[PDB]
Design a protein around this nucleic acid. Structure first.
Ligand code: ZN
Ligand code: ZN
Ligand code: ZN
Ligand code: ZN
Ligand code: ZN
Ligand code: ZN
Length: 108
DNA sequence: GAGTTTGAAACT
DNA sequence: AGTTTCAAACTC
């Protein structure tokens, strides 16, 4: 959906949101893109290396480790997904919980 | 547009 | 676990 602007990763790593969502890049702004039909062999390699690192990498779709955002900035994957942090999050200084004032203020 | 900040993903 | 890399979020 939204264009990636990768240069260094070739869009063959999870730093690339297009590749992380199991898509070919389309109309993106990436450089040296391998996330496409023209690089099928090398792309397949990246996929399996990506997968044996974590077998759930491309599972149909746990917790943040934010230090400085307070989890009220879109650096927090919880906040970006517009959901609350949970017990599994290893946040520090988390202000992204139900009864949080700052969260409520930033909500309006 | 440039430069800084951030934390997941990667690497050692 | 500590460190580096990376592309996006953010700030100016
Ligand atoms: Zn990309
Ligand atoms: Zn892309
Ligand atoms: Zn790409
Ligand atoms: Zn967070
Ligand atoms: Zn969280
Ligand atoms: Zn949090």
């Amino acid at each position: 959906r939204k264009p990636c602007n990768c240069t260094k990763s070739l869009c063959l790593k999870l730093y690339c949101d297009c590749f992380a969502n199991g898509e070919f890049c389309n109309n993106c702004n990436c450089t040296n893109c391998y996330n496409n039909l023209e690089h099928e062999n090398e792309r397949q390699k990246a996929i399996k290396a990506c997968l044996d690192r974590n077998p759930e990498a491309f599972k149909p779709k746990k917790g943040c480790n934010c230090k400085r955002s307070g989890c009220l900035k879109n650096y927090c994957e919880c906040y970006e997904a517009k959901i609350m942090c949970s017990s599994i999050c290893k946040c520090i200084g988390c202000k992204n919980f139900e009864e949080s004032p700052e969260r409520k203020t930033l909500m309006h």
